[model samples]
Target: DDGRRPIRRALISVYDKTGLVDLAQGLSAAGVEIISTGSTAKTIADTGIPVTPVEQLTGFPEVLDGRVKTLHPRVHAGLLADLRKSEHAAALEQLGIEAFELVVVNLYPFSQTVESGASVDDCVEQIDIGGPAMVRAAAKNHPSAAVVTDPLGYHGVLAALRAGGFTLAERKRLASLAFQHIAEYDIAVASWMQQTLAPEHPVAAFPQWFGRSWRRVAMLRYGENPHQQAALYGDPTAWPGLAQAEQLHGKDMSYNNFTDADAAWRAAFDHEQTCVAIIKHANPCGIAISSVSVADAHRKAHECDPLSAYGGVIAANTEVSVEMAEYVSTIFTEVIVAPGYAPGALDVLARKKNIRVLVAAEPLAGGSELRPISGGLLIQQSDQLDAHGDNPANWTLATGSPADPATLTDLVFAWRACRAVKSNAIVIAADGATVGVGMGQVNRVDAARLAVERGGERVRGAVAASDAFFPFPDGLETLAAAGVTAVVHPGGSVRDEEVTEAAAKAGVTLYLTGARHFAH
Candidate 1:
């Protein structure tokens, strides 16, 4: 053979046959013989591309329900043999199996099959053991072989093969990617099986293996700055990410837009009823709940901090109607996200082409780990606030007269919403809406004062909810002066008497749920 001889043999087999027919034709035109199996062979034949069947190459029929088709020595030995080694050449010649210069194979859709709620038996049957074996064999001999696992790589592989045949650099890169692809595929199968079959808290006799992997969802135009690069990622098991968000109308989202939009959306989930949250720089500037309509909720929330709400991100728990979109568009909102859009809402929002309008399919729920170190990650339950203590009939008012039915309802709603806020938080709500919120303050009194000041006249008849007990009477005094008509704190502070006295003096109704929801 000449030193510059063209590579003659290639294998094409893929479950996802996207662009496969064209690739096979290109390779055959370049004088490369194609070997395929089962459906891949049928597909290639249908495209009028001649292919040597794996059964023909192995001189045996596919067995074990086609699972044992590509596991033959002829298939692997040709792939694994080192072309540069004379001993490997002699061994290949002795076996009469020519080296396969290219292997294009994508494994079965195991992840997709399982994710579609398939049975365990069905999933196990779809696991492509022979496919991975062939991939590993080809990748192991990549110094002289090219292994392609992704359909996206077909064009590149064809271009490279046509340019100057396969080079060591390209082959090695492809082999590395092929290995990673198979490894991740195996890990996904293992993780799914373990989660389904293993009992809770199963004992580990040895160091058990649990796979950790993710796929990139989006690439941002820039990170925190224009000079830096960034991208969004999500677990393969999790769905409804920013990438999956529905853009009803408006402009593309930016890096900061996505970050603030997430924060705002999470904040709105704190309330059970129709609520709206406005966020800026990752902090809640305004939040409100209303039963009248989503438009009223947006109005109250925007009224809370109109200055901060400018160019901010708004998220609503209910669908956004045309009225709500029009109200929000009056201001310079960077983004607006909601569960859905009312009829003609997108048409109204389309006027603002630079504003991003996103539709979240569902409320955020479930626990996920937060990583803060290279090898350490913090795992905790998710911050989901469900409507508890609905039977206020059994609840006793610790101080002053019992609250009115309306006031008690507002108090319970505010209490749950406060739990979702950062620690040292105080929320003032009225008419089932949060009028003011002081979050992440150093002291309870400071938080109280901030909430009252921000609430202004909105707190005139609002109820206050403290995430924890007030240490001093000053918090009560601040709330009373700010026109808070009712108070709900954990009520375990050492100076409970003073706090109660202050509330009594202000003629405010006070209730203690005997629970503290402290978020650190």
Candidate 2:
């Protein structure tokens, strides 16, 4: 066969019937004979389009609970026959096997079935065998046949058929997509079977071989900078997150927008109350939780650092209100993401044409964290603040007198919010809102000084939290001199005695959490 050839015969089998009828009609209009399996044949025939059932083509009954439909030699020979070879043509002619120029098949919903928490038997049954075999066969013989595995390929294939035939380049592209589709499918099946079938094994958590897949969702205009190129890839199986979030209005998301928005999302959701987090450059500029309303939380969060909040990404745990949207519209914000928007909120937000507004289906939550290195990756369990760890009662008083209930409450809130900040992290809070945050400093002393400097007079009567212990007394002394009355830190420094002594000397109450929440 030459590089370009008309499709004389086609095979159609699919579990997802999206764009099926239109494809069949296009093929029928092109005078291409369509052969299909049980349900697909019924679907096509009901549309008043002529179709040849695989059973009729093979002269064999579909048995074994419909699992033995497309595994016949007739189907395989038709898809795999390289007609360019005279011997192959002779064999096909002798066996009365008609060569198939096109094959369209998508596998069963094994991943969806497993995700739906289906039973073992049901998931096993959904594991497709015959479908993958046919796809592989057609892909392997791409020189003679074209394979289409995704509904996305339907329009391209039909357009090509209408325009005479598929070129070699088009066939190669289709084959590549088919192979990738099958590979992703197999990876999902293997990963699921390993975890489910061998539940007690250590490999379930950290397998010997790492395998995962991500589909390219968008080609960004640039990366972290204007000179570099970047793109967004999404894991379909991952829990609802930024990739799954729906952009209600505004321009497309940028690299910085995504990073800052993710940071804000994690920070805002860390609190159970009405909360808002303003993030810039992948660090929380300000964050606050309000018992009153989301708008109040935004106001308090913005009050912490109004200058940094300008052009920052904002995230709210609760639905955004009209007041919050109106106030946010006043600022030159980059993005605002929340679970929902109240009436009049979208209209107010739309006035600022460049502001990106997104609706998150759920709060930000994840399983494991993965970061790439030179040749491998570092995998760590997600740092989560649970009730047990968040409780102030679990903290030990390390110096001075124990804080009162209100101080302890603010301490917990500060501690939880501190996790969203990058180390070396220092957060100062009063009355349920952060007055100042110093993050990403090289040393704890600088972080403390920055927090104190930014907080100014607000540092007085405020509580503080450190992601890790102070290696020296200077950091604690700085906060103490700034009038911070209470501090909570994961105290494990070698100079713990000295730090405690400094807190005692300054009349500052210090509490040790025994655990650290250090983000890199």
Best model number under TM-score: 2
Candidate 2 lDDT, 450-508, residue by residue in tens: 99999988999999999989999999999999999999998888889999999999999
Candidate 2, TM-score vs. the true structure?
0.90
Q: What residue pairs are clashing in model 1?
A: none
Candidate 1's C-alpha runs over 4 A off are 1-7, 15-31, 38-68, 82-91, 150-177, 201-212, 225-229, 234-236, 247-252, 342-344, 347-353, 364-371, 387-396, 491-506
For each candidate, C-alpha RMSD in Å?
Answer: 4.2, 2.9
Writing each residue's lDDT as its tens digit, candidate 1 over 1-520 gives: 2222246899877889999988998998888899999999998899888889998989988898877888889889889998889999899999889988889999989988888999988888889988899899889988777899998998987787677567777777889899889888988878776776563576542224456667777787888788999987766666675557777677667888887887788778776778898888777777878879889989988887789999999999888989998877689988999988888888888787788888886755665545456785555556564324323553458787788778887887788778657889998988777778888888989999889888887888889999888899998899998788889887877788888888888898888766777875
- After TM-score superposition, the amount by which residue 183's alpha carbon in candidate 2 deviates from its true location, in angstroms, is 1.7
lDDT of all predictions, in order shown?
0.82, 0.90
How well does each candidate superpose onto the true structure, as a TM-score? 0.84, 0.90
Worst lDDT run of 10 residues, candidate 2, spans: 197-206
| lDDT for position 79 in model 2 | 93
